[PDB]
């Protein structure tokens, strides 16, 4: 409702274009290895793609993937993006080679593509988001806190029309990676295949032991012995008893799981856009490794 976003496509490109770019993007992830002590670009992807989209409003509109802000100063110098500038900074090279491609495609499809090069689910994506100027950029304060509990995320996530089983399967994400005292003030990854996407998040909230701990910044967060960590929202996916029904479900079941990230990430990266009666269909990029690349 209200402000209206039509998808435009890049003049004259085709699924052909997008999967050069996706490779460019691919390609780049396998060769920076190095980042984040030999974790890899991947999860930064993700949380960028995440965090460009999460800024939206369904009720006027405002913030979304679409109209690529997160390159304007406000959004950028977000204290909720602390840590992003790293994932820009790898985007960098590949807008240069790719200069056609809009700020919003390119941070929607870093994240299609971390997630898919990670042997994560395929997820369709469609292009056309189009740069908007500076003052579209959504003030910071939009994006979600980690110290709260399920009725506080339950809440959260209706502003970007999640439903429950949505959002437990979205923070399946938070496999990946890790959090960084310097950033967030949260320290540690969430179990151990944190460059593999896999449905580990939810087996370590079930079968770790966790302790309730303060961490260096004075800020608590569960911890277990194994050296893993979840954020008191992460854990408040099994206190919440609607919550913990569908974590035991995607603990359980992987390729429901992967089927049922699919449709919430793309979904959270179109939330906001009107795609046109006649727009392409929803492209789906082939790995490199299924390219023999
Ligand atoms: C209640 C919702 C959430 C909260 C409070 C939240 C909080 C966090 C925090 C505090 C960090 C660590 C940032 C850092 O110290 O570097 C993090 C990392 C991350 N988050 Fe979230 N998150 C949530 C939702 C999601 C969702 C929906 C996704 C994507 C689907 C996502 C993907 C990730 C990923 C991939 C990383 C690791 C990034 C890294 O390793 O550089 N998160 N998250």
Redesign the pocket.
């Known amino acids: 409702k209200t402000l209206v976003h039509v998808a435009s496509v890049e003049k004259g490109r085709s699924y052909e274009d997008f999967q050069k770019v996706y490779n460019a993007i691919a390609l780049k992830l396998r060769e920076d290895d190095e980042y ?1 002590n030999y ?1 890899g670009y991947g ?2 992807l ?2 960028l793609a ?1 965090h460009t989209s999460g800024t939206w409003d369904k009720h006027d509109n405002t913030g979304g993937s679409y109209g690529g802000t997160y390159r304007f100063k406000k959004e950028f110098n977000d204290p909720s993006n602390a ?1 992003l500038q790293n994932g820009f900074k790898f985007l960098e090279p590949i807008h240069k080679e790719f200069p056609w491609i809009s700020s919003g495609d390119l941070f929607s499809l870093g994240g299609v593509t971390a997630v898919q090069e990670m042997q994560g689910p395929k997820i369709p994506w469609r292009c056309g988001r189009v740069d908007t100027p500076e003052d579209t950029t959504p003030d910071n304060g939009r994006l ?3 110290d709260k509990d399920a009725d506080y ?1 339950r809440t ?1 996530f209706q502003r970007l029309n999640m439903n429950d089983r949505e959002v437990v399967a ?2 399946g ?2 496999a ?5 005292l310097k ?2 003030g ?1 320290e540690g990854p969430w179990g151990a295949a944190n460059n593999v996407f896999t449905n580990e998040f939810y087996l370590n909230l079930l079968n770790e032991n966790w302790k309730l701990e303060k961490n260096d910044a004075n800020n608590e967060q569960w911890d277990s012995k194994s050296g893993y960590m979840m ?1 008191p ?1 992460d854990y408040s996916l099994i206190q919440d008893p609607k919550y913990l029904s569908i974590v035991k479900e995607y603990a359980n079941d992987q390729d429901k799981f992967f089927k049922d990230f699919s449709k919430a ?1 793309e979904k ?1 990266l179109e939330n906001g856009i009107t795609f046109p009666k006649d727009a392409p269909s929803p492209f789906i990029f082939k790995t490199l490794e299924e390219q023999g690349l």
Do not use: C, E, Q
């Open positions: 984040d974790i999860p930064v993700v949380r995440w840590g979600p806190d980690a995320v959260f979205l923070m994400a938070h990946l990676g890790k959090t960084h950033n967030s949260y954020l929202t990430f959270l």
